[PDB]
DNA sequence: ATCAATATTTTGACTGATAGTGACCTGTTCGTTGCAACAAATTGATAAGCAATGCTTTTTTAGAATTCCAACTTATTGTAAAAAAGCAGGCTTCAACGG
């Protein structure tokens, strides 16, 4: 699984950047994105996807184990709509 | 031409920088490690994305024009002694107007 460790190492052998800043950029990368989502801003990354924010209302739910119907509290989640470019590169993938 | 005193002739004390290694402190990097975070697994009513593909709107894109940055290659131009006037910063007196 791709981790921040592998991402930093990549920037070291592709951009020749020290692992230090290579590890600091990967952190600030996801950080800045999370700061935009929490602030209520859409994140549109061309050639990748789009992190949307939809306010879901309180809908009926339950306890998957027993079956006790419990109303799922409303909350703002963070969806991800992959671009057409990304889909065309993952359409022919393979779980490995 | 020889006394006699002061600047002269090498050494030593004075005071903090010069010299080069070493300890001090801890960012920074790497190995050991703990733990919040992530993933599998349920069950079932309700919400969101989905197949194709040309036209329209929004965002990223590769130059290319433009102008300061820059190491070179040209294009023109060229004065000083020797006098002897020409101006203002402030203290100095005569000459005209008013009591």
A95 beta carbon < 7 A from strand B?
no
Measured in angstroms, the resolution is 11.0
- Quickly give A9 CA vs B92 C1' distance in Å: 94
Q: How many CA atoms lie within 13 A of A54 on its CB side?
A: 9
PDB experimental method:
cryo-EM
d(CA A35, CA A76): 15
Could you give the angle at the alpha carbon of A87 between the alpha carbons of A85 and A88, nearest 5°? 65
- Quickly give A16 CA vs B37 C1' distance in Å: 31
User: Which tokens is A41 given?
Assistant: 């801003």
d(CA A87, CA A24): 29
From A7, A57, A12, select the one nearest A27 (Cα to Cα).
A7
């Amino acid at each position: 699984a791709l981790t921040k460790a592998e991402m930093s190492e990549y920037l070291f052998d592709k951009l020749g950047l020290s692992k230090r800043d290579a590890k600091e950029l990967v952190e600030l990368f996801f950080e800045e994105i999370r700061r935009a989502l929490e602030n209520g801003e859409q994140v549109k990354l061309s050639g990748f996807g789009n992190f949307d924010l939809r306010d879901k209302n309180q809908r009926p739910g339950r306890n998957p184990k027993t079956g006790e119907d419990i109303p799922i509290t409303a909350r703002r989640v963070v969806t991800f709509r992959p671009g057409q470019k990304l889909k065309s590169r993952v359409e022919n993938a393979s779980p490995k």
